[PDB]
Structures are given as C-alpha cells and as structure tokens.
C-alpha cells in the first residue's frame, strides 16, 4: 500500500512538500519512485522518475529525493499551474503499486460567484413520456457546492443525480444536476426549483410547466 | 513533444478479447521502457504491464498475469496490450504511460453484458440554450455546435451516472437576444458505440 497525504496548499511563490509513504516501512532506491501529475482537462504526466530524475521538459522547481525512508516531492516557489493532483508510484521489483493521489491547491484564485441556468423538460421529451429538469451551474470558485431540488416548497431526494465539480478550461468549476421525473410528476406540481448553495450564499432557479 | 495516442477500446462481454494500440511519436520510441495504467470508475490509479526497451522483458500486475500479453513493435513505434478472457473488473480507461513525460489521453474498454444503447438528444429552448443527450451506453459521447463553427459560450459538461445504469450529460451555448431569431442553432451528437449521429435544432 502506497500512502500520501490528502491535501496541501500554498500560495504562489510558497514551498510544498509532498509525502509518499510505502505501508512495508522505507522506500529505497530500488522502489524506483515516479511521482505523475494530473491537471483537470490535461493528461496524466510524468514530472519526476527514478526517485529525482526529471521530464526534460519539467520546471526545475521540482525536485524528487529519499527523506527518513520516505519518497518527497517538493515545490519550490509553486505555481499557479501546478495546481493539479500528484501522484506517487512505487516499483517492488516486479511491479507499480500507486498511491491515492495528493492535491495540491495554489491560493490566489478570487471567488466566483456560481451561474445556475435551469431547463425545464423540452416539449419533445414530454412527447416520448419523459421528463428531466437540467440544472446547470457554472464559473464558480473554489469548487465546493451543494444542490438541492424542491418540488413545490418541499424538497426532493429521489431521482436526483449529480455530478461531481469539475474545472472549466478558465480555472473555475462547473457542475451539473439531473431530476429525472414522470410526465404526470412534472404537471402534478406548480413549480419545481434547483437551489444552488456557494460559500454560504443560496442561488435558487425556478421552472414551471405553465411558460 | 512526446505523444502518445490509445485506441482499441470499445465494449465487450465477460469473456471476450481486445487489443490495445498506442502511437508514439516525438521521442526515441526505442529507449524507453513503457507501461500499460488503468483506473476504474471511482477506483483509484492500477498499473499494469510494462515492457523492456526490446521486449527481453515483461512485468504483468497479478489480476491480469495468464490473461493480457504487453508487446512492443521496435520498428513502427506501437505499444500493444492484448486482453483475452476479459473480466468485469477490467472496465477502465487504459493510459499509454512513461516515466517521464506525458501519457496518452485514454481508451475506455468496458466489460459488461448490457447492450449498447444509443442516446436521445432533446433541445433545451431558450426563454443560454442548449441540448440535452439522455440514456447511452457506454461511453463516450462527442458534441458540437453547428458543425463546430462556434467554439467559445459553449460548454459541455462530464456525463453523469443515473441510478438506471445510463449515461446523460448536456451541453449549452450563451448567445445574444438579438441572434435567436436570425441565427440557427444545431447541436451535433455522435455517440459512435451505438451508430447514433443526430443534429437537433435547439429552438425558442
Ligand atoms: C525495472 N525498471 C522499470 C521499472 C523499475 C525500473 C526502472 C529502471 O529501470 O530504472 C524503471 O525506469 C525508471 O524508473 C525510469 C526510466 C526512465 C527515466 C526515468 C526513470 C523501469
């Protein structure tokens, strides 16, 4: 089992130590420890390999060492783009063996208030004896949010289906609801809302099928 | 600048086989060893296979020994991964990966009995717009506005997972009052699984 902490931060200019940690006791260098970066909407990256041999095209600001039987991974000075999830593999002479991943957040980064655009099922779905409300949220920061759906006044649990925060190609998140209802459930009510919860701040959007 | 390129993946039954190919380009495809990851939905990074620089040798992780077979061409540079008797617990993306450098962005092979299902693209009329791509299996699904004129306003968000068992994901465009009733709005939907192309007139 490869161990790694959950989560740290820093802001820009700011140093970052990252942890890997093998259940069996020390890592040497023959665990051969290759730490791979993952930013939203990019694709998996080998920065460091071999316990501190870097991509040619990665940023000496990384570096990769052994510390107290432990694999390091440290940021000197992080940047706003290293942002992004790390990750450590460890080699046990036969084979890799990852870790859970560390997230690295640079703060900075200004609030955003989040945009929530709820549609009301189409008139062709209505057609083939369906119904799904799409609420719609994005341009929100950081990426913590709460959805709740409210037939009439009162809230609804079943048939709700949500996706997790996920960055847009700006930096900030964006998120999507489902309600997946019958027909007869969608004319039954007189409103239907997605409530849409920030940073303590509530955004409620409302559709109805009388427009 | 390294690149790598999967494909293969598609839907199979428990049982069944498929091969993986990865293209690689911008780097000494030869000098380097390579390796076979995979993450199943929710689960976390798996490492697979990985190969000699000749293919004199060949490490395989456990779930997957008597079963997948990694192999190298040294003189097209292609990584292969070939999966026989495939297992539920084989569905994953599969990354093309190095120590160094860039992985591929990903094939998704999945192992399942259910049938492939083709999604039902609804508009969602303005009163932003958009379209609404609903019940599919597996994915992927591709979307584009107007023949891919239009590439800013739009954003097409990660596909959600319904209790049923289906994918349903939409994608919406903001645009100016005043082009409603000049402009025209398509959305295409390709879901290439299922043989499902369709454009659908988004309409106030
Ligand atoms: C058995 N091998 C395999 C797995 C462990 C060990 C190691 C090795 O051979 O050095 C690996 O390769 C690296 O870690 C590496 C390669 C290129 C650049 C930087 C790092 C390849």
């Known amino acids: 089992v490869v161990i790694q902490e959950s989560a740290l931060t820093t802001s820009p200019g700011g140093t970052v130590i990252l942890t890997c940690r093998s259940s069996?006791?020390?890592?040497?260098?023959?665990?051969?420890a290759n730490w791979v970066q993952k930013k939203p909407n990019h694709v998996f990256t080998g920065l460091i390999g071999?316990?501190?041999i870097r991509a040619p095209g990665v940023p000496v600001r990384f570096s990769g060492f052994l510390i107290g039987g432990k694999a390091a991974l440290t940021i000197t000075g992080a940047q706003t783009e290293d942002d992004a999830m790390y990750f450590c593999?460890?080699?046990?002479?036969?084979?890799?063996?990852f870790g859970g991943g560390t997230k690295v957040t640079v703060l900075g980064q200004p609030k955003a208030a989040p945009s929530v655009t709820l549609f009301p099922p189409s008139s062709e779905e209505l057609q083939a004896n369906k119904a799904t409300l799409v609420c719609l949220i994005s341009d929100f920061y950081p990426g913590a949010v709460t959805v709740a759906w409210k037939a009439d006044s009162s809230p609804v649990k079943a048939g709700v289906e949500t996706t997790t925060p996920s960055k847009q190609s700006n930096n900030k998140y964006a998120a999507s609801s489902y309600l997946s209802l019958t027909p007869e459930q969608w004319k039954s009510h007189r409103s239907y809302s997605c409530q849409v919860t920030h940073e303590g701040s509530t955004v409620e959007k409302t559709v109805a099928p009388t427009e | 600048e390294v690149q790598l390129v999967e494909s293969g993946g598609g839907l199979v039954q428990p049982g069944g086989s498929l091969r993986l190919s990865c293209a690689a380009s911008?780097?000494?495809?030869?000098?380097?060893?390579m390796n076979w990851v995979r993450q199943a939905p929710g689960k976390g990074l798996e490492w697979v296979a990985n190969i000699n620089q000749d293919g004199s040798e060949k490490y395989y992780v456990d779930s997957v020994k008597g079963r997948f077979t990694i192999s190298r061409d040294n003189a097209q540079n292609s990584l292969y991964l070939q999966m026989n008797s495939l297992r539920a617990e084989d569905t994953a993306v599969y990354y093309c990966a190095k120590e160094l450098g860039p992985w591929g962005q990903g094939t998704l092979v999945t192992v399942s009995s259910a049938s492939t299902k083709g999604p039902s693209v609804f508009p969602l009329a303005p009163s932003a717009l958009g379209c609404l791509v609903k019940d599919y299996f597996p994915e992927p699904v591709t979307v584009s506005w107007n023949s891919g004129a239009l590439t800013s306003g739009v954003h097409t968000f990660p596909a959600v997972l319904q209790s049923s068992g289906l994918y349903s994901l939409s994608s919406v465009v903001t645009v100016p009052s005043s082009s409603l009733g000049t402009q025209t709005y398509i959305c295409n939907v390709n879901h290439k699984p299922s043989n499902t192309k369709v454009d659908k007139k988004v309409e106030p």
């Open positions: 593999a460890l080699w046990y002479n036969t084979h890799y063996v």
């Open positions: 071999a316990t501190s």
């Open positions: 911008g780097f000494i495809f030869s000098s380097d060893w």
């Open positions: 069996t006791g020390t890592i040497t260098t023959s665990n051969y």
